[PDB]
UniProtKB/Swiss-Prot annotation, chains A, B:
Gene that this polypeptide is encoded by: CYC1
Protein name: Cytochrome c isoform 1
Cofactor comment text: Binds 1 heme c group covalently per subunit.
A GO BP annotation: mitochondrial electron transport, cytochrome c to oxygen
Record annotation: effect of changing K77R: Loss of methylation by CTM1
Native species: Saccharomyces cerevisiae (strain ATCC 204508 / S288c) (Baker's yeast)
Transmembrane parts of this sequence: none
């Protein structure tokens, strides 16, 4: 791809410091500011049940792959204009790689 | 995405007439001219065990999503120069959509 595996250990702590405020990843984890992310890889954007997403994220209808997820994370609003995710992005590829490595694993 | 679901029924018969010559899709199906495709979505190219792939397909290291799969199928050799898949492609989007719909389903 254009995604290279990194450190899941490193990725777990980036999740905690940059995503945990708004999201859960475990199966059976609740929706918070953002939706629970269990089973996100391979899914299309805006389909978790019982979460109120923006029109923007549903219509973009992104198919979530480690690769896709990387561009999103770099700059969420530049990737999906209209998204309400108020994350300013992970600008370093090395951070994105580690985070994705972790997510790939915990969201399964 | 840029993949719209189609007819799985239609997709099953396109598979039979355009892919079955070289591939199986069922779990536990054998490798033939081409590799068994069970569990291909989400996987990277050239990783089925016990299949001898080209250098080209392993190094391209494509991450298989309905979207990716679509470009491949349009023109395999233009998408992965060096691939030994001797398919000249599915030029109509409507055929690709139906086929992918089917594959999404049977490869699971
Ligand atoms: C609150 C301040 C957030 C932080 C920090 C992060 N995310 Fe987020 N996320 C948030 C919202 C409000 C939403 C919904 C967007 C909308 O327009 O409706 C999202 C959405 C996602 C998604 C898409 C989910 C889907 O399609 O089901 C993903 C993949 C995602 N968020 C991941 C993610 C990661 C990995 C984060 C840390 C780097 C992160 N988000 C931060 C709110 C917030
Ligand atoms: C024989 C004449 C083939 C036909 C007809 C189709 N495919 Fe094929 N496929 C074939 C080979 C020899 C290979 C290996 C390529 C290499 O360079 O090593 C492939 C490979 C695939 C792949 C990639 C598999 C992977 O990464 O594990 C896919 C996704 C694939 N083939 C799909 C596919 C479909 C859907 C077809 C019908 C439209 C089809 N192939 C035709 C040989 C042949």
């Amino acid at each position: 791809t254009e995604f290279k595996a990194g450190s899941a250990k490193k990725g777990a702590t980036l999740f905690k410091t940059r995503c945990l405020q708004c999201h859960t990843v475990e199966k059976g984890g609740p929706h918070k500011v953002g939706p629970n992310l269990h089973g996100i890889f391979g899914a299309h954007s805006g389909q978790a049940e019982g979460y109120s997403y923006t029109d923007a994220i549903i219509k973009k209808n992104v198919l979530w792959d480690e690769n896709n997820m990387s561009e999103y994370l770099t700059n969420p609003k530049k990737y999906i204009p209209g998204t309400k995710m108020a994350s300013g992005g992970l600008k370093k590829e090395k951070d994105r790689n580690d985070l994705i490595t972790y997510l790939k694993k915990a969201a399964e």
